[PDB]
Write a protein that binds this ligand. Sequence first.
Ligand code: NH4
Length: 165
Amino acid sequence: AGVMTGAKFTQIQFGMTRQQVLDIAGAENCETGGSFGDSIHCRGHAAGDYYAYATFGFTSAAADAKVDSKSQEKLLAPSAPTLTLAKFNQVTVGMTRAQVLATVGQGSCTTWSEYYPAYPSTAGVTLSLSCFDVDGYSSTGFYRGSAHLWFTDGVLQGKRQWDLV
Ligand SMILES: [N+]
């Protein structure tokens, strides 16, 4: 029932088939083809330009293919955002995911994108986090203070911010 939600996103697991994903998300919410290729894109509540949404990628277009990629915008909210420019600057290329979260706060970041290129293997796993200052997150409009953090194999590779002080 209903649109795509953070709860349904959380319930979907790497390794699930397309049938299982569509059963959980609600097939009326979702589309494939065009620019998405074989990925499945599912819409949540309206949100300015567009909608919150999730995009799921699969090992192949086959019926038994497995979820190897999960991405979302505006479905999960950061729980306690405290990011500052100071914290952003003390994060460094080469830190582990655990040292980064300790630096920026457990509750400042949500998972933007998570992809296993050799699923079920964890080699080459790429993770992107989107992290916010105190009013930087919007579930409806433009963001107001955020960073993106890119990890490969568990280690920070890159960082970028917009509007942090
Ligand atoms: N892609």
